[PDB]
């Protein structure tokens, strides 16, 4: 007998963290993982996700076979668990992160890592950019704007200051943390899924430029 809701909370926090959809950065322990996987088991409507978790115990380099209706079932399960969009590459990220947790034995520190081994050929960025550009020119653009469309700055200081005071209680520093980490996580996951080299050094160089400017 255990607190179902408490394990549910642990599962949700852990999955929101390793999904990198939540900028919130919180450490987890082996207590957390056992707790989350127990919640995943007991949840009858998450047996399929628990079985994906069980399969991750192997080398987890396999893209498991699953029919489209089973995909519907698992996406319903994840949508229910996360109560948000989210899609298949997110599931691949789930398996990668949880299983790369599994492969790690007991260690006295929480290792920090970067997503990889998600979606085959080891890719770089130059041909990626070239193929992207040629594909863009292949497709047709949708919208066109003309005229020197005036910047519609809102003159009335009343509502300007109203929205200001609306945002004034906001602790900007949290804004910075959230948005910067959002940039970082999306860039790393986009490079990992493409198999293209996520250049952390270039991200840090963007930082350096920002301090220097």
């Amino acid at each position: 007998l255990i607190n179902m809701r408490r394990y549910r909370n642990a599962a949700r926090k852990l999955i929101h963290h390793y999904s990198l959809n939540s900028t919130s950065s919180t450490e987890y322990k082996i207590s957390d993982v056992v707790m989350t996987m127990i919640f995943l088991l007991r949840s009858e409507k998450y047996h399929s996700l628990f079985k994906l978790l069980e399969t991750t115990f192997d080398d987890y380099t396999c893209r498991p076979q699953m029919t489209q209706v089973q995909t519907d079932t698992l996406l319903d399960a994840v949508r229910s668990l996360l109560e948000m969009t989210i899609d298949l590459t997110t599931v691949d990220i789930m398996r990668s992160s949880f299983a790369r947790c599994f492969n790690s034995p007991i260690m006295r520190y929480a290792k920090i890592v970067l997503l990889q081994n998600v979606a085959d050929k080891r890719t770089t960025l130059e041909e990626l950019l070239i193929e992207r550009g040629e594909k863009i020119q292949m497709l047709q653009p949708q919208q066109y704007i003309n005229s020197g469309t005036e910047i519609p700055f809102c003159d009335d200081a009343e509502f300007l200051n109203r929205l200001l005071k609306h945002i004034d209680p906001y602790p900007l520093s949290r804004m910075y943390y959230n948005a910067a980490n959002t940039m970082f996580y999306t860039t790393m996951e986009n490079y990992a899924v493409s198999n293209c080299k996520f250049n952390i050094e270039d991200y840090n160089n963007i930082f350096k430029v920002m301090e220097n400017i």
Binding site: I112, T149, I151, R174, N178, I200, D202, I213
Partner: protein
Amino acid sequence: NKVRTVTEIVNSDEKIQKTYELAEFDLKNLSSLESYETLKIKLALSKYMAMLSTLEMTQPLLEIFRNKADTRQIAAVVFSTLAFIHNRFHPLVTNFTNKMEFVVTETNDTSIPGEPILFTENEGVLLCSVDRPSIVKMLSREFDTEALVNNCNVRIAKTFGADFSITEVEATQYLTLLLTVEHAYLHYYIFKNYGVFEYCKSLTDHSLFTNKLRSTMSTNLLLSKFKFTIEDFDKINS
């Protein structure tokens, strides 16, 4: 360090020395400067919100970019963003070039990592490729509106010395899209100032941005406010 200052009446040898700690005045100067900085940045944010609302949107931004069909308003939002950037960087020209095109990318094989949005001239005028899929996924993300982010002593001393609906998460997402367009517009500055080759070189290597913008930006960026790094390099890069 310390500033000895003399209270002297020449009518007598009586001098009453009174040293003053420069730390308190430095902290006051600092506190005033960050308060003014937060003020200016939040005024810029509120002005951007007000001009967006003068665009007369109905949906919040996340549902705005959720739509799969109306590229008209997506393109209008993108033009508004980039024009605002060109404005508060170059107020003398508060309007972007006359003509432009828009292509709304919908898939990953067309979404480029690192710079999901981009410009590229059709050889007649610049056009923008916009990554609605990834950007929208980015928006739908949770943000840490509940946990605080952080010298201690200075912070503690300063702390002791101290109807449109918008949430802190909405402001987080607005800052997020604003900084994304910051970066995109910097790349576009590289483009329109040094050619497509140097555009690509800045896209691949952003250290070039310091060099290129030492001519223009110095004479500004909102993101320069805080100091940014990625966690744990000591045992990441190891």
